[PDB]
């Protein structure tokens, strides 16, 4: 690509000769063989990174990167969530405690998304005709106002 880029530079400079500042791009693509999409990509592609700490500027007071955060998240989100957990928990955990297990088994509320009804049916007590019934039952139960109207605000 380095060469392609350079080659473009020269070829585009030729365009610039006729069309000053080669404003042509897609027209340059008639000679660039590809939408400016890659031309601009090339542009960014050919960028050299920055010290993360070049002293900032308009003031030598500080380096760069000292105005951002890591891949982490603010407690504000953390908590809200964790509320969700329990909020739920109880709110679920007030209708058919056994079934509530499968609610967490065939779903989350722990660390499976899942335990495929298949495996789950037998997991709790070996079953085939007692699963998606209580499944929907559980949902529609904790669904509808007064029930689902508790996560209605905490839709997290």
């Amino acid at each position: 690509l380095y060469e392609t880029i350079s080659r473009i530079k020269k070829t585009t400079k030729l365009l610039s000769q006729e069309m000053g500042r080669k404003p042509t791009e897609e027209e340059i693509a008639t000679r660039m063989e590809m939408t400016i999409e890659k031309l601009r990509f090339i542009a960014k592609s050919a960028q050299l990174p920055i010290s993360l700490e070049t002293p900032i500027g308009k003031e030598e007071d500080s380096r760069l990167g000292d105005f951002i955060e890591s891949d982490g998240e603010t407690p504000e989100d953390q908590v809200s969530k964790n509320l969700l957990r329990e909020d739920l928990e109880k709110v679920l955990d007030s209708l058919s405690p056994r079934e509530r297990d499968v609610l967490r088994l065939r779903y989350g509320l722990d660390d499976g998304r899942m335990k495929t009804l298949e495996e789950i049916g037998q997991i709790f007590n070996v079953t085939r005709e007692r699963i998606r019934q209580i499944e929907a039952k559980a949902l529609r139960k904790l669904r509808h106002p007064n029930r689902n109207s508790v996560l209605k605000e905490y839709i997290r």
Binding site: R140, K141, R143, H144, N146
Partner: peptide
């Protein structure tokens, strides 16, 4: 149309 316990 929803219901309390269920059946819509």
């Amino acid at each position: 149309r929803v219901y309390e316990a269920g059946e819509e």
